[PDB]
Amino acid sequence: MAYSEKVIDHYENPRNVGSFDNNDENVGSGMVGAPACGAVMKLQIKVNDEGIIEDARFKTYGCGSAIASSSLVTEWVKGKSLDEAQAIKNTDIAEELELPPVKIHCSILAEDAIKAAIADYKSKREAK
C-alpha cells in the first residue's frame, strides 16, 4: 500500500451519483481492492424482507476506462437473491466481457465485490 497519487476525485462536482442516500436498514455495501491491481470496486444493493435484490447501485473509484465488470455484475444482481448473487463465479464475468489477459484478476473482483455487499446486509439485521 503506497501513497497512490490518485485520491480525491470529482466529476464536475456530482451529487452523490451511484448512491441511495445513506442506508435503508437493509442495504449492503461491498468494497474490494488489490495492491498490484491499484483499484477499488464499490457497488450498492437493496434487499427486502423476503431477501431478494430489488435495487442495485454502483459508484466510480479508480483511474481507468469504464469498467464493464461492475456494470455487468450490477445488472445481474438486480432482481437476484442473496445466494444467487453470492453464487456467481468470476468465470462467468470473465467470459461475459472477455477481459484482457493483462489482469484477469479484474474479473474476480467483480464477483467478489458484489458478495461483500450481501455479507454486509446480513450483518445489518444480525446486530440490532
State the catalytic residue, choosing from 106, 110, 114, 117: 106
Backbone angles phi, psi at 97, to 5 degrees: -115, 0
C-beta neighbour count of 29 within 10 angstroms: 18
Which three-class secondary structure state does DSSP give residue 121? helix
- Could you give the angle at which helices 68-77 and 90-97 cross, rounded to 10 degrees? 120
Q: Which three cell numbers stand for residue 68?
A: 464493464
Q: Is 63 a catalytic residue?
A: no
| Cβ 24 vs Cβ 47: under 8 Å | no
Which alpha helices (H) appear in the chain, and where do they start and end? 68-77, 82-87, 90-97, 105-126
* Residue 15: HSE in the Cβ half-sphere, 13 Å Cα cutoff: 0
State the catalytic residue, choosing from 19, 20, 34, 37: 37
Fold of 26-127: Sufe protein. Chain: A (3.90.1010)
**What is d(CA 39, CA 4) in angstroms, rounded to the nearest whole number?**
10
Q: Is 106 a catalytic residue?
A: yes
Q: For the chain, which residues make up each domain, given as ranges?
A: 26-127
User: Please, what's the b/e burial string for 82-110 (b: 16 or more CB within 10 A of its CB; e: otherwise)?
Assistant: beebbebebeebbebeebeeeeeebbbbb
**What is d(CA 26, CA 125) in angstroms, rounded to the nearest whole number?**
8
Q: Which residues contact 59 (CB under 8 A, 6 or more apart)?
A: 17, 18, 19, 42, 43, 44
The technique is: NMR
| Cβ 113 vs Cβ 31: under 8 Å | yes
Length of the chain: 128
**What is d(CA 92, CA 98) in angstroms, rounded to the nearest whole number?**
9
